Amino acid sequence: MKVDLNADAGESYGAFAYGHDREIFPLVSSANLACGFHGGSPGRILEAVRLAKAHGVAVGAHPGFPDLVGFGRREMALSPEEVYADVLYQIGALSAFLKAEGLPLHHVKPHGALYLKACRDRETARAIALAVKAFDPGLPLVVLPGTVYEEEARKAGLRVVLEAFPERAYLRSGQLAPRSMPGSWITDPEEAARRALRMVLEGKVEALDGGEVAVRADTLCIHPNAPEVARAVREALEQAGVEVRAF
Amino acid sequence: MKVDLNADAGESYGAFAYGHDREIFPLVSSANLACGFHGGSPGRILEAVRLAKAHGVAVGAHPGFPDLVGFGRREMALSPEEVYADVLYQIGALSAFLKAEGLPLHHVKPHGALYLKACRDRETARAIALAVKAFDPGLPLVVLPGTVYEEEARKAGLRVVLEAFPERAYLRSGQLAPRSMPGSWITDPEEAARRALRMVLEGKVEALDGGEVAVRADTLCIHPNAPEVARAVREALEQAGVEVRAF
Amino acid sequence: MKVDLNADAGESYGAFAYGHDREIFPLVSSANLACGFHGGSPGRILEAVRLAKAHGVAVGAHPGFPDLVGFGRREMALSPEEVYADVLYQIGALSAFLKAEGLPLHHVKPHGALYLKACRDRETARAIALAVKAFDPGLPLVVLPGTVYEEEARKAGLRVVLEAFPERAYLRSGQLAPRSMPGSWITDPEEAARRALRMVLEGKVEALDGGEVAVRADTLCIHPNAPEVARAVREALEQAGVEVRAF
Amino acid sequence: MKVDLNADAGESYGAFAYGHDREIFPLVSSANLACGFHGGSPGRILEAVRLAKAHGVAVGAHPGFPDLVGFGRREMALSPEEVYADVLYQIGALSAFLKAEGLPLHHVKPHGALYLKACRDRETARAIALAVKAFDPGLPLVVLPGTVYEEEARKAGLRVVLEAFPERAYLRSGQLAPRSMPGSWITDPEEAARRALRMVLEGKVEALDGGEVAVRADTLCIHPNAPEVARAVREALEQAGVEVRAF
């Protein structure tokens, strides 16, 4: 069986280095690159694309809100029209670097607060979906299963890719546990790898509030010690005979 | 005979409306749209592209320095690597809006200080040329004839388009007269139209410092009262039997 | 009797001219100057301060959200800590220009979405109040009467200035009528002037949903045709024997 | 004898942590804090000011060019008017945080390319000097000795503070050796400390191109392994009986 391992990257801005792209790229099969709004200045995008290419990592767009200082982690009251234009702008900018390096745009996955706004706001979700569709109808959109975001993406006629989080706790409802909830985030790479295997091999994950829940992981998202977690997860999957490859 | 009339557009940023796109688009055959660095926020780009499409105007990229407050009119010590990445980023962003609207990217023409830096700096000129070539080898680059900029563009293997300025005075050397030089800028739309016709029909323009100089105008650049000048110029050309069409 | 007439100003950014400061300054007694976040680049701030000084207009800070493209008109999920720091930064920046021109900082009044967030969010309101207090305990804060914003400002120990809007319709509740509600905004300068006089002379204004409501106007806020409205309002007040002066 | 040890700080921007303020502050007597243009977002400024206060470090403004992505390290063709306004804006913004924390603004020292432009351009140097003077005539300006920058500062009537660089090689001319010149930068903290002592105790430093040159160090500037160098330098000075205190 196979699964895609994805991680955010190229979020550095100018002189401000961010993340551990060098350590993460050799472990993942796909990367979500920032497009200059919440991170990723032009030179850093070019650098990240070159790194991904060198490591045979598939590159997708990681569009976000126009809030650099806030790293796109803050909710912003953008109109659907503004979301559509901002997403198009970002996808296009990244695609130029991929074109220069002879690589295709693999997917699109919203970043931070935009992602969250999409998961609970139909108009925002629809705007993202239409922007992606208008750019390339064939582009897959990474979404959180069971959300209005997955719904609008499907209604738009886009191919959807289901994401799972081995580092985040799940609730019986099938949705992610609230951030600051005791035990909401799995820190031990060993358990995360354990959970990852389970999600792939069995399509299920333990639930924080009792029992377990079903989850179909087309791709597994990886976050500090991210390299360690990513390492642990990839190894557990490969030692298990699971192929880690871009979706 | 035919000639292209081009003007900058889509330079508005957010709530800050700029220029007279509505009045200029029905007069020109090509437009140079800002890409978010010295002007042109995403929503304004989308708006300008829609307007151009409605008026059958060809759209090209107008990349500039990353200096919004300065409107990209200030020289910046960008390394060639930075110029290359910034230009790619901008061309890509604009191309996404054209793709959504089913339009092709017609050309590329640097804006303000970047344009000027290119005209006198070989490394900058080369960086712009390579960025354009890396994105689409078939993209024509608008340049100032007789400059190192035209040279590097040709050395890069790109198709070059020669620009002339009916509103600017020329010197016997064949280059544009210094900005603050007495009589450097033609304000009377009548004379500008007069000069425009001459450049097209005869391939020559009066020189400020005596006599006249040769000029091949594949395209004529148009700037306040820009609409009046553009109007006067287009009419003089059409009443003369000259076809105004995108190059 | 006397009253202060205030209007926003200095919102231009770089090459992007905004508003009609030249036409408005000779009509108002106080101005709320942008501080570089939603508008007002350094050069434009300096320009606005010089203009105010030339016209003997009192200058206050008009801090907003860090959203230039959105003109600070979009709600942003800033933490109270972030609101506090952003407001301090802005007040300080403007105060430097006033110091250079030998003028005092007259007041503080939040801009756009920040203002609205303050009117309904106690933590945001408190953060603004504390920032102002930390900079100068003696600085008056302009607020909307009957809001949690007025409450937190008073709880913080700051002097509060009550603002009224002759151009906006009021509801019996005493609060402003919703923006897109039929008849929510008074366009006729004559009626606005009429309402303005009433608010000053009688401390009351007609209510959109029947009868009238009480309103104490320490200052009257003025907005396109803003100059006309401002003109009409100031004249109605002066021809009525009401002194227009900074609070 | 006494001397001031200064280092840049507070350059982090939003989520982008930069430098080693925590390690450097306990070693220096003065810090040059970024003001939001080339680094230092509002929250990070507040954080740096709090840290300095906790460590009894004197805080000065470190104004720079409006080039965040370039970290203010790139030459920009700002007019003297623009330099003046930008510097005022920045000094004012930082002063608000100092006021809130009950601390005075200790000095002003330009950052990166602005600093370099000032050292060779009289109009830029004058603009900086006048901005500082307009804000507070009593504010000392840190300058490079023997430059047009020191000259304009003195002509402006400002108190000037002479800076020396124990980590940079000097030429017989008395000016700093070119960056990429073999041996231009002292990496060994031991030698840097050695040089530092010499500059203080003897007012001289070895010259790269032979012999030595005179240098009066009112303050010593400290830069990766900056903490190590700063540590080595402070210890060498204290073990030598030299008092490290703000000028």
XYZ file of N, CA and C in Angstrom, chain A residues 35-37 42-43 45-46 50 84-86 88-89 92-93 96-97 99-100 134-135, chain B residues 35-37 42-43 45-46 50 84-86 88-89 92-93 96-97 99-100 134-135:
126
model
N 3.605 31.153 -0.684
C 3.602 31.947 -1.905
C 3.794 33.458 -1.755
N 4.467 33.885 -0.687
C 4.739 35.302 -0.497
C 3.782 36.128 0.347
N 2.690 35.532 0.811
C 1.718 36.272 1.626
C 1.928 36.122 3.133
N 10.238 35.811 -2.805
C 10.647 35.221 -4.091
C 11.924 34.372 -4.093
N 12.993 34.898 -3.506
C 14.246 34.161 -3.459
C 14.133 32.868 -2.669
N 11.364 31.162 -2.278
C 10.515 30.237 -3.018
C 11.406 29.492 -4.005
N 12.214 30.251 -4.740
C 13.121 29.680 -5.727
C 14.031 28.650 -5.065
N 14.069 24.581 -5.762
C 15.301 23.920 -6.176
C 15.590 22.740 -5.256
N -10.618 34.571 -3.623
C -10.416 34.078 -4.986
C -9.201 34.725 -5.667
N -9.131 36.053 -5.618
C -8.034 36.787 -6.237
C -6.691 36.511 -5.559
N -6.693 36.486 -4.232
C -5.461 36.232 -3.487
C -4.909 34.834 -3.758
N -5.513 32.955 -6.463
C -5.044 32.897 -7.851
C -3.650 33.502 -7.977
N -3.486 34.678 -7.378
C -2.224 35.398 -7.400
C -1.093 34.520 -6.876
N -0.345 31.358 -9.034
C 0.376 31.781 -10.224
C 1.837 32.090 -9.968
N 2.108 32.825 -8.889
C 3.481 33.186 -8.558
C 4.346 31.941 -8.377
N 5.329 29.942 -11.574
C 6.391 30.487 -12.413
C 7.733 29.842 -12.060
N 7.982 29.636 -10.768
C 9.221 29.006 -10.318
C 9.258 27.533 -10.729
N 7.729 26.297 -13.338
C 7.912 26.307 -14.784
C 9.389 26.483 -15.130
N 10.059 27.408 -14.445
C 11.482 27.658 -14.676
C 12.324 26.424 -14.366
N -10.106 27.532 -11.823
C -9.888 28.502 -12.892
C -8.453 28.456 -13.415
N -7.507 28.126 -12.538
C -6.097 28.050 -12.920
C -5.779 26.754 -13.667
N 2.113 44.012 -11.146
C 2.012 42.674 -10.578
C 2.087 42.556 -9.054
N 1.698 43.612 -8.340
C 1.688 43.564 -6.885
C 2.901 44.073 -6.123
N 3.955 44.470 -6.827
C 5.163 44.965 -6.156
C 5.215 46.487 -6.015
N -3.998 42.077 -5.751
C -4.725 41.009 -6.458
C -6.095 41.369 -7.044
N -6.943 42.001 -6.239
C -8.263 42.382 -6.713
C -8.207 43.382 -7.856
N -5.711 43.664 -9.959
C -5.167 42.995 -11.134
C -6.330 42.320 -11.853
N -7.134 41.586 -11.089
C -8.284 40.880 -11.636
C -9.204 41.862 -12.356
N -9.998 41.981 -16.406
C -11.372 41.899 -16.885
C -11.664 43.064 -17.824
N 15.898 38.306 -10.956
C 15.373 37.112 -11.620
C 14.167 36.515 -10.880
N 14.314 36.315 -9.572
C 13.248 35.742 -8.759
C 12.028 36.660 -8.666
N 12.272 37.951 -8.472
C 11.175 38.912 -8.368
C 10.373 39.006 -9.664
N 10.168 36.656 -12.041
C 9.446 35.395 -12.239
C 8.163 35.371 -11.415
N 8.296 35.748 -10.146
C 7.179 35.782 -9.218
C 6.043 36.635 -9.773
N 4.429 35.272 -13.052
C 3.574 34.149 -12.704
C 2.251 34.562 -12.092
N 2.301 35.507 -11.152
C 1.086 35.970 -10.493
C 0.088 36.521 -11.509
N -1.767 33.963 -13.788
C -2.870 33.208 -13.202
C -4.206 33.882 -13.519
N -4.240 35.212 -13.460
C -5.456 35.961 -13.767
C -5.795 35.855 -15.254
N -4.986 33.331 -17.164
C -5.431 31.956 -17.358
C -6.901 31.814 -16.971
N -7.281 32.403 -15.837
C -8.666 32.350 -15.369
C -9.617 33.020 -16.358
N 12.793 31.806 -19.028
C 12.533 30.616 -18.223
C 11.037 30.339 -18.088
N 10.230 31.399 -18.087
C 8.779 31.262 -17.962
C 8.132 30.838 -19.282
